[PDB]
Design a protein around this nucleic acid. Structure first.
Ligand code: D3T
Ligand code: MG
Ligand code: NA
Length: 319
DNA sequence: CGGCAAATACTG
DNA sequence: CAGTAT
DNA sequence: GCCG
Protein backbone atom coordinates (compact mmCIF):
# COMPACT_ATOMS: atom_id res chain seq x y z
CA UNK A 1 0.00 0.00 0.00
CA UNK A 2 2.44 2.65 1.18
CA UNK A 3 5.00 1.12 -1.18
CA UNK A 4 2.69 0.59 -4.14
CA UNK A 5 1.81 4.29 -4.00
CA UNK A 6 5.33 5.49 -4.79
CA UNK A 7 5.25 3.49 -8.02
CA UNK A 8 1.75 4.69 -8.85
CA UNK A 9 2.87 8.32 -8.63
CA UNK A 10 6.04 7.65 -10.61
CA UNK A 11 4.10 6.09 -13.48
CA UNK A 12 1.54 8.89 -13.27
CA UNK A 13 4.17 11.63 -13.58
CA UNK A 14 5.81 9.62 -16.36
CA UNK A 15 2.62 9.57 -18.42
CA UNK A 16 1.60 5.91 -18.13
CA UNK A 17 -1.93 6.80 -17.07
CA UNK A 18 -3.43 3.32 -17.34
CA UNK A 19 -0.63 1.58 -15.46
CA UNK A 20 -0.99 4.30 -12.84
CA UNK A 21 -4.73 3.66 -12.52
CA UNK A 22 -3.93 -0.05 -12.41
CA UNK A 23 -1.77 0.45 -9.33
CA UNK A 24 -4.25 2.88 -7.82
CA UNK A 25 -6.98 0.24 -8.08
CA UNK A 26 -4.83 -2.44 -6.44
CA UNK A 27 -3.82 -0.04 -3.66
CA UNK A 28 -7.48 0.81 -3.07
CA UNK A 29 -8.29 -2.89 -2.87
CA UNK A 30 -5.54 -3.65 -0.36
CA UNK A 31 -6.82 -0.72 1.70
CA UNK A 32 -10.17 -2.51 1.98
CA UNK A 33 -9.15 -6.13 2.64
CA UNK A 34 -10.77 -7.79 5.66
CA UNK A 35 -7.24 -8.98 6.45
CA UNK A 36 -3.62 -8.16 5.57
CA UNK A 37 -2.32 -10.06 2.52
CA UNK A 38 -0.68 -13.18 3.94
CA UNK A 39 -0.05 -15.12 0.73
CA UNK A 40 0.40 -15.01 -3.04
CA UNK A 41 -2.75 -17.05 -3.65
CA UNK A 42 -4.59 -14.64 -1.36
CA UNK A 43 -3.39 -11.58 -3.27
CA UNK A 44 -4.50 -13.08 -6.59
CA UNK A 45 -7.93 -13.73 -5.06
CA UNK A 46 -8.54 -10.00 -4.76
CA UNK A 47 -10.15 -8.25 -7.77
CA UNK A 48 -7.85 -5.62 -9.22
CA UNK A 49 -4.82 -7.68 -8.29
CA UNK A 50 -3.02 -10.20 -10.49
CA UNK A 51 0.18 -12.24 -10.55
CA UNK A 52 2.29 -9.15 -11.27
CA UNK A 53 0.95 -7.14 -8.35
CA UNK A 54 0.70 -10.27 -6.19
CA UNK A 55 4.37 -11.03 -6.77
CA UNK A 56 5.40 -7.53 -5.69
CA UNK A 57 3.17 -7.95 -2.64
CA UNK A 58 4.63 -11.35 -1.75
CA UNK A 59 7.97 -9.54 -1.97
CA UNK A 60 7.23 -6.49 0.17
CA UNK A 61 5.50 -8.66 2.78
CA UNK A 62 8.55 -10.93 2.79
CA UNK A 63 11.76 -9.19 1.67
CA UNK A 64 10.46 -6.14 3.51
CA UNK A 65 11.36 -4.11 0.43
CA UNK A 66 10.37 -3.90 -3.25
CA UNK A 67 13.26 -3.96 -5.72
CA UNK A 68 11.07 -1.95 -8.11
CA UNK A 69 11.02 1.13 -5.86
CA UNK A 70 14.83 1.08 -5.71
CA UNK A 71 15.10 1.27 -9.51
CA UNK A 72 12.84 4.26 -10.19
CA UNK A 73 14.53 6.91 -12.35
CA UNK A 74 16.05 9.85 -10.49
CA UNK A 75 14.16 12.06 -12.93
CA UNK A 76 10.80 11.37 -11.31
CA UNK A 77 11.09 13.80 -8.36
CA UNK A 78 12.03 16.57 -10.81
CA UNK A 79 9.28 15.59 -13.27
CA UNK A 80 6.80 15.75 -10.37
CA UNK A 81 8.16 19.16 -9.31
CA UNK A 82 7.72 20.54 -12.84
CA UNK A 83 4.37 18.86 -13.41
CA UNK A 84 2.96 20.64 -10.37
CA UNK A 85 3.23 23.97 -12.18
CA UNK A 86 -0.28 24.89 -13.41
CA UNK A 87 -0.41 24.52 -17.18
CA UNK A 88 2.54 22.17 -17.36
CA UNK A 89 1.95 18.45 -17.71
CA UNK A 90 4.01 15.32 -18.41
CA UNK A 91 5.10 16.44 -21.89
CA UNK A 92 6.35 19.84 -20.81
CA UNK A 93 8.06 18.43 -17.71
CA UNK A 94 9.88 15.82 -19.78
CA UNK A 95 10.92 18.48 -22.31
CA UNK A 96 12.29 20.77 -19.58
CA UNK A 97 14.13 17.83 -18.04
CA UNK A 98 15.68 16.86 -21.37
CA UNK A 99 16.79 20.49 -21.72
CA UNK A 100 18.74 20.06 -18.49
CA UNK A 101 16.44 21.87 -16.06
CA UNK A 102 16.32 20.39 -12.57
CA UNK A 103 14.79 23.04 -10.29
CA UNK A 104 12.18 25.81 -10.26
CA UNK A 105 15.02 28.32 -10.25
CA UNK A 106 16.18 26.77 -13.55
CA UNK A 107 12.62 27.14 -14.86
CA UNK A 108 12.26 30.70 -13.62
CA UNK A 109 15.52 31.85 -15.21
CA UNK A 110 15.97 29.67 -18.31
CA UNK A 111 12.73 27.92 -19.34
CA UNK A 112 10.27 29.20 -21.92
CA UNK A 113 6.94 29.63 -20.13
CA UNK A 114 3.39 29.96 -21.41
CA UNK A 115 1.20 32.67 -19.89
CA UNK A 116 -0.56 30.06 -17.74
CA UNK A 117 2.68 28.44 -16.61
CA UNK A 118 4.13 31.77 -15.50
CA UNK A 119 1.05 32.30 -13.32
CA UNK A 120 1.37 28.74 -12.06
CA UNK A 121 4.99 29.36 -11.13
CA UNK A 122 4.21 32.68 -9.41
CA UNK A 123 1.71 30.90 -7.17
CA UNK A 124 3.52 27.57 -6.99
CA UNK A 125 3.23 26.97 -3.23
CA UNK A 126 -0.28 28.39 -2.90
CA UNK A 127 -1.59 26.15 -5.70
CA UNK A 128 -0.43 23.06 -3.79
CA UNK A 129 -2.30 24.13 -0.65
CA UNK A 130 -5.90 23.32 0.18
CA UNK A 131 -8.13 25.88 1.85
CA UNK A 132 -10.48 25.45 4.83
CA UNK A 133 -14.06 24.74 3.75
CA UNK A 134 -15.08 28.03 5.40
CA UNK A 135 -12.87 30.04 3.04
CA UNK A 136 -14.49 28.27 0.10
CA UNK A 137 -17.83 29.55 1.39
CA UNK A 138 -16.48 33.10 1.53
CA UNK A 139 -15.23 32.81 -2.05
CA UNK A 140 -18.56 31.41 -3.30
CA UNK A 141 -20.42 34.26 -1.60
CA UNK A 142 -18.10 36.81 -3.20
CA UNK A 143 -18.99 35.43 -6.63
CA UNK A 144 -22.70 34.97 -5.90
CA UNK A 145 -23.07 38.55 -4.63
CA UNK A 146 -21.33 40.05 -7.66
CA UNK A 147 -23.58 37.91 -9.87
CA UNK A 148 -26.86 38.71 -8.12
CA UNK A 149 -25.87 42.38 -8.19
CA UNK A 150 -26.76 42.75 -11.87
CA UNK A 151 -29.31 39.91 -11.95
CA UNK A 152 -30.86 38.85 -8.65
CA UNK A 153 -32.34 35.89 -10.50
CA UNK A 154 -29.02 34.08 -11.02
CA UNK A 155 -28.49 30.79 -9.21
CA UNK A 156 -24.99 30.11 -7.81
CA UNK A 157 -23.85 26.81 -6.33
CA UNK A 158 -20.48 25.76 -4.92
CA UNK A 159 -19.76 22.29 -6.31
CA UNK A 160 -16.74 19.99 -6.39
CA UNK A 161 -15.22 18.84 -3.11
CA UNK A 162 -17.19 21.59 -1.37
CA UNK A 163 -20.59 20.11 -2.24
CA UNK A 164 -19.32 16.61 -1.43
CA UNK A 165 -18.84 17.88 2.12
CA UNK A 166 -15.04 17.87 2.37
CA UNK A 167 -13.31 19.75 5.21
CA UNK A 168 -10.81 21.34 2.81
CA UNK A 169 -10.96 22.29 -0.89
CA UNK A 170 -8.27 22.45 -3.57
CA UNK A 171 -10.12 25.21 -5.41
CA UNK A 172 -13.65 26.60 -5.39
CA UNK A 173 -15.97 25.42 -8.16
CA UNK A 174 -18.96 27.71 -8.71
CA UNK A 175 -21.83 26.75 -11.02
CA UNK A 176 -23.96 29.64 -12.30
CA UNK A 177 -27.30 29.36 -14.12
CA UNK A 178 -30.73 31.02 -14.39
CA UNK A 179 -34.16 29.36 -13.99
CA UNK A 180 -35.63 31.59 -16.71
CA UNK A 181 -33.59 29.61 -19.23
CA UNK A 182 -32.12 32.69 -20.92
CA UNK A 183 -30.51 35.22 -18.57
CA UNK A 184 -27.28 33.19 -18.36
CA UNK A 185 -26.14 34.22 -21.84
CA UNK A 186 -23.17 36.59 -21.92
CA UNK A 187 -23.03 37.12 -18.16
CA UNK A 188 -19.33 36.20 -17.92
CA UNK A 189 -18.28 39.63 -19.17
CA UNK A 190 -20.29 41.44 -16.48
CA UNK A 191 -19.32 39.15 -13.61
CA UNK A 192 -15.60 39.07 -14.33
CA UNK A 193 -15.44 42.85 -14.83
CA UNK A 194 -17.20 43.28 -11.50
CA UNK A 195 -14.98 40.84 -9.62
CA UNK A 196 -11.94 42.56 -11.12
CA UNK A 197 -13.18 46.02 -10.14
CA UNK A 198 -13.07 45.01 -6.47
CA UNK A 199 -9.65 43.45 -6.90
CA UNK A 200 -10.90 39.95 -6.06
CA UNK A 201 -9.50 38.28 -9.20
CA UNK A 202 -5.70 38.43 -9.41
CA UNK A 203 -4.91 36.32 -12.49
CA UNK A 204 -6.67 34.63 -15.43
CA UNK A 205 -5.73 31.13 -16.61
CA UNK A 206 -8.51 30.08 -19.01
CA UNK A 207 -11.12 32.63 -20.08
CA UNK A 208 -12.28 32.88 -23.71
CA UNK A 209 -13.93 36.28 -23.25
CA UNK A 210 -13.92 37.09 -26.98
CA UNK A 211 -16.36 34.20 -27.29
CA UNK A 212 -19.90 35.00 -26.21
CA UNK A 213 -20.42 31.27 -25.76
CA UNK A 214 -17.71 31.07 -23.08
CA UNK A 215 -18.51 28.15 -20.77
CA UNK A 216 -15.82 28.33 -18.10
CA UNK A 217 -13.53 30.68 -16.22
CA UNK A 218 -10.41 29.28 -14.57
CA UNK A 219 -8.55 31.86 -12.55
CA UNK A 220 -6.99 33.02 -9.31
CA UNK A 221 -8.52 35.11 -6.52
CA UNK A 222 -7.66 36.37 -3.03
CA UNK A 223 -9.99 37.53 -0.27
CA UNK A 224 -9.28 40.88 1.47
CA UNK A 225 -7.32 41.31 4.70
CA UNK A 226 -4.12 39.81 6.16
CA UNK A 227 -3.15 36.15 6.19
CA UNK A 228 -4.85 35.44 2.87
CA UNK A 229 -3.43 33.15 0.19
CA UNK A 230 -4.15 33.16 -3.56
CA UNK A 231 -6.83 30.55 -4.31
CA UNK A 232 -7.87 28.85 -7.54
CA UNK A 233 -11.39 29.58 -8.80
CA UNK A 234 -13.32 27.58 -11.40
CA UNK A 235 -16.59 29.05 -12.64
CA UNK A 236 -18.98 27.63 -15.22
CA UNK A 237 -22.13 29.33 -16.50
CA UNK A 238 -24.70 26.90 -17.88
CA UNK A 239 -28.16 26.95 -19.55
CA UNK A 240 -30.88 25.92 -17.10
CA UNK A 241 -31.82 22.98 -19.34
CA UNK A 242 -28.37 21.51 -18.62
CA UNK A 243 -28.39 22.39 -14.91
CA UNK A 244 -28.81 18.80 -13.71
CA UNK A 245 -26.02 17.37 -15.84
CA UNK A 246 -23.73 20.36 -15.16
CA UNK A 247 -24.26 20.10 -11.39
CA UNK A 248 -23.61 16.35 -11.49
CA UNK A 249 -20.44 16.82 -13.52
CA UNK A 250 -19.11 19.74 -11.48
CA UNK A 251 -19.83 17.97 -8.20
CA UNK A 252 -17.82 14.89 -9.13
CA UNK A 253 -15.65 13.40 -7.91
CA UNK A 254 -13.57 12.92 -11.07
CA UNK A 255 -13.33 9.20 -10.41
CA UNK A 256 -17.06 9.09 -9.71
CA UNK A 257 -17.82 10.88 -12.98
CA UNK A 258 -15.64 8.57 -15.08
CA UNK A 259 -17.27 5.50 -13.51
CA UNK A 260 -20.79 6.84 -14.03
CA UNK A 261 -20.06 7.79 -17.64
CA UNK A 262 -18.48 4.36 -18.16
CA UNK A 263 -21.70 2.76 -16.94
CA UNK A 264 -23.83 4.85 -19.28
CA UNK A 265 -21.49 3.74 -22.06
CA UNK A 266 -22.17 0.06 -21.31
CA UNK A 267 -25.86 0.86 -21.77
CA UNK A 268 -25.40 2.44 -25.19
CA UNK A 269 -25.78 5.84 -23.54
CA UNK A 270 -23.49 8.84 -23.00
CA UNK A 271 -23.15 11.38 -20.18
CA UNK A 272 -21.51 14.82 -20.34
CA UNK A 273 -21.93 18.14 -18.51
CA UNK A 274 -24.41 19.03 -21.24
CA UNK A 275 -26.74 16.04 -21.17
CA UNK A 276 -27.47 12.33 -20.82
CA UNK A 277 -28.05 10.72 -24.21
CA UNK A 278 -29.39 7.36 -25.35
CA UNK A 279 -29.12 5.28 -28.52
CA UNK A 280 -25.50 6.39 -28.87
CA UNK A 281 -23.59 4.64 -31.65
CA UNK A 282 -19.99 3.55 -31.02
CA UNK A 283 -17.44 1.52 -33.00
CA UNK A 284 -15.46 -1.54 -31.87
CA UNK A 285 -12.75 0.69 -30.40
CA UNK A 286 -15.39 2.19 -28.13
CA UNK A 287 -15.33 5.57 -29.87
CA UNK A 288 -18.56 7.43 -30.65
CA UNK A 289 -19.80 7.44 -34.25
CA UNK A 290 -23.43 8.43 -33.70
CA UNK A 291 -24.82 11.18 -31.37
CA UNK A 292 -28.05 9.52 -30.22
CA UNK A 293 -30.95 11.30 -28.49
CA UNK A 294 -30.87 13.66 -25.52
CA UNK A 295 -32.96 12.43 -22.58
CA UNK A 296 -34.90 14.75 -20.26
CA UNK A 297 -33.03 15.23 -16.97
CA UNK A 298 -34.66 17.92 -14.76
CA UNK A 299 -32.78 16.78 -11.66
CA UNK A 300 -29.70 14.77 -10.77
CA UNK A 301 -32.03 12.03 -9.53
CA UNK A 302 -33.40 11.77 -13.07
CA UNK A 303 -29.89 11.03 -14.33
CA UNK A 304 -29.34 8.20 -11.84
CA UNK A 305 -32.80 6.77 -12.51
CA UNK A 306 -32.38 6.75 -16.28
CA UNK A 307 -29.15 4.84 -15.66
CA UNK A 308 -30.88 2.35 -13.39
CA UNK A 309 -28.79 3.46 -10.43
CA UNK A 310 -29.92 4.28 -6.89
CA UNK A 311 -29.56 8.00 -6.16
CA UNK A 312 -26.37 8.98 -4.33
CA UNK A 313 -25.99 12.14 -2.26
CA UNK A 314 -22.88 14.27 -3.01
CA UNK A 315 -20.97 12.91 0.01
CA UNK A 316 -21.67 9.46 -1.45
CA UNK A 317 -19.78 10.39 -4.63
CA UNK A 318 -16.43 11.06 -2.95
CA UNK A 319 -14.50 8.45 -4.93
C1' DC B 1 -4.95 -7.80 -28.37
C1' DG B 2 -6.69 -3.74 -26.35
C1' DG B 3 -10.18 -1.27 -23.50
C1' DC B 4 -10.22 0.33 -18.81
C1' DA B 5 -11.69 5.50 -14.44
C1' DA B 6 -15.23 9.85 -19.78
C1' DA B 7 -16.31 13.36 -22.27
C1' DT B 8 -15.77 17.78 -23.06
C1' DA B 9 -13.45 23.09 -22.85
C1' DC B 10 -9.44 26.53 -23.96
C1' DT B 11 -4.73 27.73 -25.68
C1' DG B 12 -1.58 28.77 -29.46
C1' DC C 1 -3.93 19.38 -33.75
C1' DA C 2 -1.11 18.40 -28.99
C1' DG C 3 -1.17 19.50 -24.44
C1' DT C 4 -3.43 20.50 -20.25
C1' DA C 5 -7.35 21.04 -17.48
C1' DT C 6 -12.32 19.96 -15.36
C1' DG D 1 -1.11 -2.84 -14.06
C1' DC D 2 -5.80 -5.77 -14.66
C1' DC D 3 -8.65 -8.84 -17.14
C1' DG D 4 -11.60 -11.07 -20.81
C1 D3T E 1 -10.21 16.85 -12.44
C2 D3T E 1 -11.56 16.51 -12.98
C3 D3T E 1 -12.70 17.03 -12.48
N1 D3T E 1 -13.95 16.70 -12.94
C4 D3T E 1 -15.16 17.30 -12.35
C5 D3T E 1 -15.54 16.62 -11.03
C6 D3T E 1 -14.90 17.54 -10.00
C7 D3T E 1 -15.09 18.91 -10.64
C8 D3T E 1 -14.12 19.98 -10.17
O1 D3T E 1 -12.78 19.51 -10.31
P1 D3T E 1 -11.72 19.64 -9.12
O2 D3T E 1 -10.41 19.28 -9.72
O3 D3T E 1 -11.86 20.96 -8.47
O4 D3T E 1 -12.05 18.55 -8.12
P2 D3T E 1 -12.55 18.62 -6.68
O5 D3T E 1 -13.32 17.35 -6.48
O6 D3T E 1 -13.22 19.91 -6.41
O7 D3T E 1 -11.36 18.49 -5.75
P3 D3T E 1 -10.54 19.59 -5.10
O8 D3T E 1 -11.05 19.85 -3.73
O9 D3T E 1 -10.76 20.86 -5.85
O10 D3T E 1 -9.13 19.20 -5.26
O11 D3T E 1 -14.91 18.66 -12.06
C9 D3T E 1 -14.12 15.80 -13.96
O12 D3T E 1 -15.22 15.46 -14.38
N2 D3T E 1 -12.96 15.29 -14.48
C10 D3T E 1 -11.67 15.58 -14.08
O13 D3T E 1 -10.72 15.06 -14.65
MG1 MG F 1 -12.58 21.69 -6.73
NA1 NA G 1 0.52 20.98 -13.93
Amino acid sequence: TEKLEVLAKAYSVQGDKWRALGYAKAINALKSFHKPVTSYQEACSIPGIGKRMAEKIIEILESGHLRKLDHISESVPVLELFSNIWGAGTKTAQMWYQQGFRSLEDIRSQASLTTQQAIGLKHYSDFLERMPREEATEIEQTVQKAAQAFNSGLLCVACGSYRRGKATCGDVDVLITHPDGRSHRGIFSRLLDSLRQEGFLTDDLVSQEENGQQQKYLGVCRLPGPGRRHRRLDIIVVPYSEFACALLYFTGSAHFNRSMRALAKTKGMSLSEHALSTAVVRNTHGAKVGPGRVLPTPTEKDVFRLLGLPYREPAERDW
